């Protein structure tokens with residue numbers, strides 16, 4: 148198109164009635180597919196994070212699974228490492244775990260007990276904030292390792308689901324908002 | 327790739343008997359956590375790919391979920407987009423899916439119907455090649471979209487499981503090898 152924000156915005160594809168009737172799904176797949184829009188997305192998140200924390204971040208925490216598509220590349224742009232927060236069962240060795248609500252049921256996330264040392268400053272990233280279930284669980288786990296969660300970020304936020312309120316006092320930033 | 331490769335090898339951590347007895351789990355998590363290791367792994371994959379295929383690659387395809395950690399960064403380094411291959415039920419809109427065999431029973435993968443156009447040339451990435459079942463299924467999905475799979479790559483290859491044979495005649499490159 149032209150601007151970087153509109154380049155990202157034109158590449159978020161809408162799918163009505165997926166996964167269930169009445170929902171409007173936001174697919175980030177086109178953002179990844181277009182190298183110019185992927186780099187526009189990473190650069191917007193990076194510039195936000197650099198301006199906001201002045202270089203003083205220790206790690207990005209990428210959220211299983213779609214957050215893994217952004218976390219490493221964001222971290223690398225910022226010159227940082229990326230740690231992983233995963234669905235239960237996926238990581239080897241001693242873990243901490245936290246439950247959250249998933250569709251009609253309950254699920255769990257986990258982090259390795261040595262993923263972070265105390266006092267490390269971390270930004271959580273995922274593609275999309277919907278109910279805020281996994282993101283909230285992520286914050287719980289990081290606090291348990293005595294990490295300082297600076298904020299959570301996503302490319303997209305679905306405001307009608309009120310996942311941002313669920314994260315307070317943890318600050319939250321999104322690039323784009325839809326219902 | 328001596329020094330750079332040692333930076334990767336040093337950060338692969340092994341866990342006996344996970345997830346089940348007699349399996350040595352290879353954990354790439356410390357590679358992601360160290361930005362120099364991550365940058366070395368991405369550079370070494372990119373360098374091999376450019377030295378082998380030059381500018382003939384159109385897209386990287388990342389395998390759900392640990393392939394997601396490397397695909398976008400590899401595609402960015404090459405100036406290419408990245409397309410996604412997911413566990414069934416995760417992608418919106420029209421898809422093609424297939425089933426393949428695992429340790430007792432079946433698993434299923436899928437791809438969006440419009441991920442690639444015919445004759446487009448793709449390299450598949452995952453973190454580790456074991457039996458090659460998953461990567462083989464990804465190759466088959468991509469074939470059904472009339473994509474040309476130039477190569478599959480990973481950080482680790484478990485050579486006693488003969489994943490390389492399963493993929494033939496699609497070439498396969500790994501940074502590190504173990505029995």
Ligand SMILES: Nc1ncnc2c1ncn2[C@@H]1O[C@H](COP(=O)(O)O)[C@@H](O)[C@H]1O
Nearest residue numbers: 350351352454455456457458459460461
């Ligand atoms: N020993 C192992 N360590 C880590 N991941 C493994 C191991 N064996 C299999 N996998 C994973 O299982 C999938 C590969 O299985 P395969 O389809 O048998 O090649 C990939 O996602 C690998 O990352």
